[PDB]
């Protein structure tokens, strides 16, 4: 048996548990465990890279050997080789 005065007041009064669950639910305030979480971004980025590559191939095919372009980075290759070697040694491979 309930008190009719206290019941009327507190009935549509949302408890902390209900208020919080509504915020957690509406703003998705919990950890996402799904592996498909990054798929949409990855797909879009993969397709954007395909367009980039396709357009660069076409622009290279048009320019031919008449192109002034030279992109041979031996130094950043050296640094990346040294980085990988040390990382291999410290990993004990």
């Amino acid at each position: 048996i309930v008190d009719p005065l206290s019941f009327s007041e507190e009935r549509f009064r949302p408890s902390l548990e209900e208020r919080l669950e509504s915020i957690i639910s509406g703003a998705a305030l919990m950890a996402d465990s799904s592996c498909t979480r990054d798929d949409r971004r990855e797909r879009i980025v993969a397709e954007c890279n395909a367009v980039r590559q396709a357009l660069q191939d076409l622009l290279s095919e048009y320019m031919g050997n008449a192109g002034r372009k030279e992109r041979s980075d031996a130094l950043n290759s050296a640094i990346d080789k040294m980085t990988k070697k040390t990382r291999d040694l410290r990993r004990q491979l």
Binding site: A28, A31, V45, E47, V51, L55, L58
Partner: protein, 248 residues
């Protein structure tokens, strides 16, 4: 830099350079009087790549909860498709005449249009990605406006227990976003504002425990200080929302 994320920069910047070198090459008469090889096979490779992007773009718009994405992404599809039409034409003109000077105009416009459209699609998707973060930030803002309601120790335990996963989510989303950004002051501001929110979390909890303890017997300072912490924590989250939306 020119593009506000590492991904956008890596995609657009090399093609921007190539197109620019090409514009200069024409002006310098470098390609003058030379026969252009058949570009119908590479143009088909661009057509194929553009179609795939549009498909993925259309699929994203169909399944997205974001109404702003549904609206802002489709114009990019038209833009990237129309520029591809220009490129098909330029290749056909160079097929009919390998020495065509008019053809170089649709080749540049076509290439810039595809790139401009791809840029628009990336920026629009980045905005949607940022809106996922603001959703979680606005959620923690609303969760904080509930701190005044907690007048019981049983309430405090539940409020605290349920704040952790959303706070860790926001912190994870900020740390991942920060690493992608190219404007270094933007990263600084996000890292600092998130660190401030994190150091103020224990402070906020203790402040509430005080208000609940002082609610029992013999309060205004406990009320004021708890509000100050909520006010300061909320100010930092609003700053994260502001910084998150900066692209230059």
């Amino acid at each position: 830099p020119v593009f506000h994320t590492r991904t956008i920069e890596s995609i657009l910047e090399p093609v921007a350079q190539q197109i620019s070198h090409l514009v200069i090459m024409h002006e310098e008469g470098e390609v003058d009087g030379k026969a252009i090889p058949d570009l119908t096979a590479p143009v088909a490779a661009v057509q194929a790549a553009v179609s795939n992007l549009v498909r993925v773009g259309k699929e994203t718009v169909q399944t997205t909860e974001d109404q702003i994405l549904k609206r802002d992404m489709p114009p990019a599809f038209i833009k990237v498709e129309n520029a591809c039409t220009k490129l098909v034409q330029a290749a056909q003109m160079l097929q009919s005449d390998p020495y065509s000077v008019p053809a170089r105009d649709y080749l540049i416009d076509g290439s810039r249009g595809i790139l401009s459209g791809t840029s628009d699609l990336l920026l629009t998707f980045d905005e949607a990605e940022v809106r996922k973060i603001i959703r979680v930030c606005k959620g923690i803002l609303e969760y904080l406006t509930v701190a005044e309601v907690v007048e019981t120790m049983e309430d405090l335990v539940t409020y605290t227990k349920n704040l952790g996963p959303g706070m860790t989510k926001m912190a994870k989303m900020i740390d991942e976003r920060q690493q992608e950004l190219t404007h270094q002051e933007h990263r600084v501001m996000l890292v600092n504002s998130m660190n401030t929110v994190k150091e103020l979390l224990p402070v906020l909890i203790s402040a509430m425990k005080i208000f609940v303890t002082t609610k029992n017997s013999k309060i205004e300072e406990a009320l004021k200080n708890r509000n100050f912490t909520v006010e300061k924590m909320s100010a930092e989250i609003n700053e994260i929302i502001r910084v998150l939306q900066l692209t230059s």
